[model samples]
Target: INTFDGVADYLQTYHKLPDNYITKSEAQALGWVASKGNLCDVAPGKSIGGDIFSNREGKLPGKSGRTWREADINYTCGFRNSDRILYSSDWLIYKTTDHYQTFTKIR
Candidate 1:
C-alpha cells in the first residue's frame, strides 16, 4: 500500500487517468498544509495552522492509511485549508487484473 502527498506522488501512484479524470484532492490539501508549515506566527490560534492541526496527526481512518483521500477531498471541496500542514492517511489497494497495466481503487 502507498500514500500520495505531492504532485509527483500523485502521478507516480496512478497509472494514468483519462484526460479529465478526477484528480487527487490531496494535492490541494497538501498545498494548504505546506503553506501553514511555512508560516511564522505568535498567536496561539495561528501558532500551528494547517491541515496537520485540523486533521489530528493525519491518522488514517482505517487500520492502515485509508482516510487520507477522503479527508483531502472533503476538506478541499469544503473550502477549508488546513491551519497547519498535515499528512494524508491514504491506503491504496491494487489488483493485477490488467497485468499491472492499470489499477483500480480496491479499498
Candidate 2:
C-alpha cells in the first residue's frame, strides 16, 4: 500500500464504520497513543526502540524479528522539524533491542 487512503478506501468499501486513522508508521503511533497523558512519554524519552534482534537469536528487518510474540517497545516520529506536535500529526522515533541499543530520528 503506497498510501493510507488506499487502506481507508478498502475499509470504507468493505469494513464499515469506526474507521482507523491510518498512520504512516505503526511503531511511532502506538507509543504516542500510550503517551497521551504524559507529554514525555514517547519511546524516545525512555530510550526504547524496536528490536532488531530478540535475545541472542539474530537480527531481522522491521517486519520480522518475531517481536509479535516477545515483549517489545519502540518509538519514531515524522520527518518534520517542529517543537510543537499536534496529537493527530506529530512524528518521533525510539528503538531498543533489549537495553543494548536506542535510536532517535535525526530530523
Candidate 3:
C-alpha cells in the first residue's frame, strides 16, 4: 500500500482497519474530543474512525440497508482538515482530502 488507494485496498483485503486506525469511541475513551485534537497525547499512532458516517447529506451512493464509517487520514493533532477515509459495511471505499467537499471512489 503506497498510496491512499492502497490503504483503502488494505482495509478491504483485511476486512479490518490498519493498525493506525482507531474507532472514534475508542479515542474518546482515551480522552479525545474533536475540539481538542489531543488523540496522540492519549493514544499514540492512531486516527479517528470506525463510527457511523450517517450520510445525511446523501453525498455517497447508498442502498436502504447500507451503512458507512469515517476515518481521519494522516491525522496527528490539531483541527481536522480535509483528509478522510469513508468506507461501508458493503465494501465501498472513498477518499476525501478536501474536508468532505468532494470524494473519490477508491474501492
Evaluated with lDDT, which candidate comes out highest? 3
* Candidate 1 ranges with C-alpha deviation above 4 Å: 1-89
RMSD of 2: 15.4
TM-score leader? 3
Task: Give all candidates' CA lDDT scores.
Answer: 0.29, 0.28, 0.78
TM for every model, in the order presented, reads: 0.16, 0.16, 0.85
Model 3, runs deviating above 4 Å: 1-3
Task: Summarize candidate 3's per-residue lDDT along 15-39 as a digit string, tens digits.
Answer: 7777777787788778888787787
**Candidate 1 all-Cα RMSD:** 14.0
- Give lDDT tens digits, candidate 1, residues 12-96: 4663321222223434333434444422121111221112222244232335433332222112223334221122344342222
Steric overlap count per candidate? 13, 13, 1
> Which pairs of residues clash in candidate 3, taking residues 3 or more apart in a chain or in different chains?
82-99
Candidate 2 overall lDDT versus native:
0.28
Tell me the tens digit of each residue's lDDT in model 2 across 1-107.
21223323433354321222223244455554533433134433332212222334332234332331111222233332112111101112223333424333221
What local lDDT score does residue 61 receive in model 2, on the 0 to 100 scale? 30
